[PDB]
Amino acid sequence: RFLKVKNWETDVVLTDTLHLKSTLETGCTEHICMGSIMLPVRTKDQLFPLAKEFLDQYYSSIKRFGSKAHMDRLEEVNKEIESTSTYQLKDTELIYGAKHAWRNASRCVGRIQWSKLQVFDARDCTTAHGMFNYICNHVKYATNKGNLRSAITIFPQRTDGKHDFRVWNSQLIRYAGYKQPDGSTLGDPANVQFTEICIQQGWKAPRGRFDVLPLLLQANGNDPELFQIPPELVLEVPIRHPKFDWFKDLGLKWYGLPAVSNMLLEIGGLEFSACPFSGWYMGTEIGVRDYCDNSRYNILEEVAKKMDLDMRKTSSLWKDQALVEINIAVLYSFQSDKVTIVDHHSATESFIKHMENEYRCRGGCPADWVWIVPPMSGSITPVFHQEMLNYRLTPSFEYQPDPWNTHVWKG
Amino acid sequence: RFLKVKNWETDVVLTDTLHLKSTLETGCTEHICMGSIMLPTKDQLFPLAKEFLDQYYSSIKRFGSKAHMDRLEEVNKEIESTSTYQLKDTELIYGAKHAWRNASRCVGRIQWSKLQVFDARDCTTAHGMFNYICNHVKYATNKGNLRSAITIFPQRTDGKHDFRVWNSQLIRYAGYKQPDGSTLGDPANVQFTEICIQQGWKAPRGRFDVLPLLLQANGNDPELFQIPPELVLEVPIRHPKFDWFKDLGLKWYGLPAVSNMLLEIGGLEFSACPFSGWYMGTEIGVRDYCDNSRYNILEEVAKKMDLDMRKTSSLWKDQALVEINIAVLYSFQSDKVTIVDHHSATESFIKHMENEYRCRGGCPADWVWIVPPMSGSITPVFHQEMLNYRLTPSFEYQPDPWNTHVW
Ligand code: HEM
Ligand code: HEM
Ligand SMILES: CCc1cc(CNC)cc(OCc2ccc3ccc(N)nc3c2)c1
Ligand SMILES: CCc1cc(CNC)cc(OCc2ccc3ccc(N)nc3c2)c1
Ligand SMILES: C[C@H](O)[C@H](O)[C@H]1CNc2nc(N)[nH]c(=O)c2N1
Ligand SMILES: C[C@H](O)[C@H](O)[C@H]1CNc2nc(N)[nH]c(=O)c2N1
Ligand SMILES: [Zn+2]
């Protein structure tokens, strides 16, 4: 079957055949679309088809399909499964899998970069201290003094689900959130619950607006352990505005390295429950969502108040006006400090080029419009006018429930 | 099967049971989501009529009444006999209001029950359509105090005698493909502005020329009519701060009046059913003014603001976009013409969603269309999970007449 997408700004039409290789489900049916829904122990019965499919893909990509090398590997993986009820990926396979998980991440606008991922194999890791060391090296490598580099560090796969490796942090670097008795919040409200856990686990909280959280690391299903990232490794950027001198005095800064650490990497049926990865920021992640979401730092009012905007009626668009300057300031600051960042205009433009290239060479590019379109200035970016097909390919990054909701405490 | 939707800004969770009464298809499957795709006989008819009459008589607290059964058999007889049927006025009004209530892409549905329905089913000629439409326009505009309205022309019979309004909106500005290669007026209407001239219009080849109506009655060739200028309320666009803004020479019309959709009620098809409400500011300022394939004035406005247009990372496009949308709102409000900003409208819709979940068991909503084209995540609807499904009565899309007209 053929599927056509259209760009209503340029009238370019692309044809999707890749969706036929789609395994997983969307959540949608013929009778309901769950396109805007945010979130819509494995036996051997189902493992070998998943392994075979991955290896068929792998050996196609290296143009060795049906080769003796291909067949032996299948045989090898096969025996290893029914002998051990799992199997191990070769280094080459792991690298391929991680890159393609990224390539398949339909909610990621940054995928033009997917082929240049630095994969750190941490499958020989056994303890939380080992995890901390690997993560430090990831952060140092990825940060690269502000010239950021995409990286992923992959810890050992799940076995019985009773020995999981997990990073309890949602990102490697994030600021603490503290709920005050008067109901207000100090720091990042998104992180209040995790902060509390850390504090409970023995973390001594500086209780400021921008405390970098400690890593909380779980190895081999053991109780997690606290570690402080060395501050010299945490690159941060003070936020100032190129024309507004009072903006510096708002006291804002942000960290340079976005490193998501709570997702699950699936490759050939194998589940890597700890696989922190990092790229670099799109400006709006910080300027729009982190600073201006009502449920986050929520600085729109103070900025608008300092701009002397008409804040009495919404139709003045004072919120809209302050939002733009804040995002200007975030971009200005990162660029002035020579820290890699991309504006939403450049990023969406690159993604369209990527997507078109993917249709030509791959026969498709699964893409989640709801997530690809930036949280401000939607229709003046080219992805707004781009029709997209969303479907799920493997290898993939998957959501997993927060570890504190499922962890069996040892003590 | 009983679905939950979460607001991630407020943690509020609503349970949706209404989707289980869905009939039409979404375009989606379990394998692929098409959520961002713009455009996905006698025996067919009676279940369709029955389903509608069921929800109608249920709605008036008379489900399973004698009148219900009587109406059912009455309609069933008329179908068996005439191969179609006619709606009672009360049912027509209900169906129209509920078509609007069911429009999953419409952010303005908190107003759905306050709709003025104009029964134009006795119309027989294009001249009659023109008269009905002028009356619609005058009533809806109401000297700037806009009132929602729909005018419903005769239903389809055998597709040979369709009533169609060839305009996409009752009021739109002309677009001309210039010799030097550019485009004067509205580029979205270049083909229609051509067809108008191609059937005898005389364009004042200006920038904001209100297009003539091209009305098709009973399957006949369509006819040109000019809306009396005094019926077309326009708003000169100035900025409350930049006095050079007015020099740009921009204005827009007060009445957004979509006229190319198909209204389906109880299996009956109304191919000519122009309806109107009032603008959300971003429709004009974000889409009509700044879309690349439209008036695309961003670069011009950015210039006069003397913004750094060297690199995209200065967000000059963004900065300009906000000021433009400030001006639109400011102009309309000054001139006492109804308009809603995207903050209040999206706030209205959340409250409306709340209401619909609470009294109806849900509210079909297309997130891709409900979220405004600017400042998305600082409006409440961005953080609102929505379920999209298709309820009847409905507004549907139909081919442009000039691709189908048995000429
Ligand atoms: C290199 C520059 C990159 C940029 C500019 C970028 C940009 C983005 C943005 C803006 C989002 C939406 C995030 C949000 O709004 O919360 C996203 C999502 C995502 N990205 Fe990328 N990204 C980059 C690199 C990467 C890398 C290296 C990976 C993995 C190896 C990755 C995988 C993903 C995944 C799995 C999501 C979806 C998160 C979810 O499902 O909720 N990205 N990206
Ligand atoms: C009264 C104030 C109203 C407001 C503020 C409003 C707002 C909107 C907006 C902003 C859109 C997005 C369309 C676009 O971006 O092109 C829309 C779509 C739509 N509106 Fe409403 N609207 C109003 C009244 C009405 C009325 C009176 C009707 C019908 C009787 C209606 C039916 C629809 C339909 C059917 C669509 C989407 C068409 C489709 O399926 O693609 N609206 N509306
Ligand atoms: C719902 C799961 C989730 C939530 C959130 C925060 N929402 C409040 C963020 C999530 O992932 C967000 C993400 C993932 C990968 C990225 C890679 C690079 C980059 N610059 N940003 C990313 C951002 C996933
Ligand atoms: C695809 C269906 C569609 C397309 C387009 C043009 N987009 C290229 C416009 C459509 O309708 C757009 C519409 C409909 C009803 C409205 C009622 C009030 C209002 N203020 N705006 C409306 C705007 C529907
Ligand atoms: C391709 C994409 O679906 C298309 O650009 C849509 C996106 N969302 C929209 N939303 C509204 N309200 N109006 C539109 O015309 C569109 N266009
Ligand atoms: C309910 C809705 O799906 C949710 O708010 C989504 C919308 N689109 C998004 N898009 C991005 N990039 N990031 C997000 O967190 C979200 N949140
Ligand atoms: Zn869908």
**Cβ B275 under 6 angstroms from ligand 2:** yes
Residue of B nearest to A289 (CA): B377
CATH superfamily of B234-256+279-344: Nitric Oxide Synthase; Chain A, domain 3 (3.90.1230.10)
- What SS3 class is residue A62? coil
CA distance to partner chain B, nearest, from residue A16 (Å): 11
For B186-278, strand residue ranges (E) read 213-216, 223-225, 234-236, 251-253, 257-258, 262-265, 268-270, 275-276
Closest by CA position to B313, among listed A42, A242, A143: A242
Counted across chains A and B, CB pairs separated by less than 8 A come out at 207
Ligand 6 shell residues, CB under 6 Å: A 36, 38, 370-371; B 8, 382-385
CA distance to partner chain A, nearest, from residue B95 (Å): 21
Which residues of B are the active-site residues? 106, 109, 278, 283
Measured CA angle at A265 (ends A260, A269), to 5 deg:
170
B26:A19 CB<8 A: no
- Answer yes or no: are the C-beta atoms of B119 and B88 closer than 8 Å: no
Does B71 lie at the interface with A, CB-CB under 8 angstroms? no
- Answer yes or no: are the C-beta atoms of A354 and A362 closer than 8 Å: no
Of the candidate CATH numbers 3.90.340.10, 3.40.50.150, 3.20.20.210, 3.30.70.1520, the domain formed by B16-121+148-158+262-276+346-370 belongs to: 3.90.340.10
Residue minimizing CA distance to atom 22 of ligand 1: A110
Half-sphere exposure of A362 (CA within 13 A, CB side): 18
- Answer yes or no: are the C-beta atoms of B183 and B208 closer than 8 Å: no
**What is the residue extent of each domain of chain A?**
16-123+150-160+264-278+348-372, 124-149+164-235+399-403, 236-258+281-346
Our separate counts of H helices and E strands in chain B read 11, 16
Q: Which long-range contacts (CB under 8 A, 24 or more apart) does A357-361 make?
A: A359/A14, A359/A15, A359/A16
Does A32 lie at the interface with B, CB-CB under 8 angstroms? yes
Does A373 lie at the interface with B, CB-CB under 8 angstroms? yes
CA A72 to chain CA centroid, nearest Å:
35
Q: What is the resolution of this structure in A?
A: 1.9
Closest by CA position to B350, among listed B124, B144, B107, B148: B107
Measured CA angle at A114 (ends A113, A117), to 5 deg:
95
Following CA atoms A310, A316, A317, A322 in sequence, which dihedral angle do they give, to the nearest 10 degrees? -20
DSSP string for residues in A157-205: PPSSSSS--EE-SSBSS-B-EEE-TTS-EEE-GGGHHHHHHHHHTT---
- Contacts with A, B 249-288, CB within 8 Å: 281, 286-287
Q: CB atoms < 10 A from the CB of B190, how many? A: 17
Report residue B199 as tokens. 């059937």
CA distance to partner chain B, nearest, from residue A149 (Å): 20
Which residues of chain B neighbour A383 with C-beta distances below 8 Å?
Answer: none
Which residues of chain B neighbour A364 with C-beta distances below 8 Å?
Answer: none
B122-147+162-233+397-401 in CATH: which number?
3.90.440.10
Residue minimizing CA distance to atom 25 of ligand 1: A279
- What SS3 class is residue A21? helix
Q: Is CATH 3.40.50.280 the classification given to domain A236-258+281-346?
A: no
Mention the CATH class of domain A124-149+164-235+399-403: alpha beta
Experimental approach taken: X-ray
Which residues of A are the active-site residues? 108, 111, 280, 285
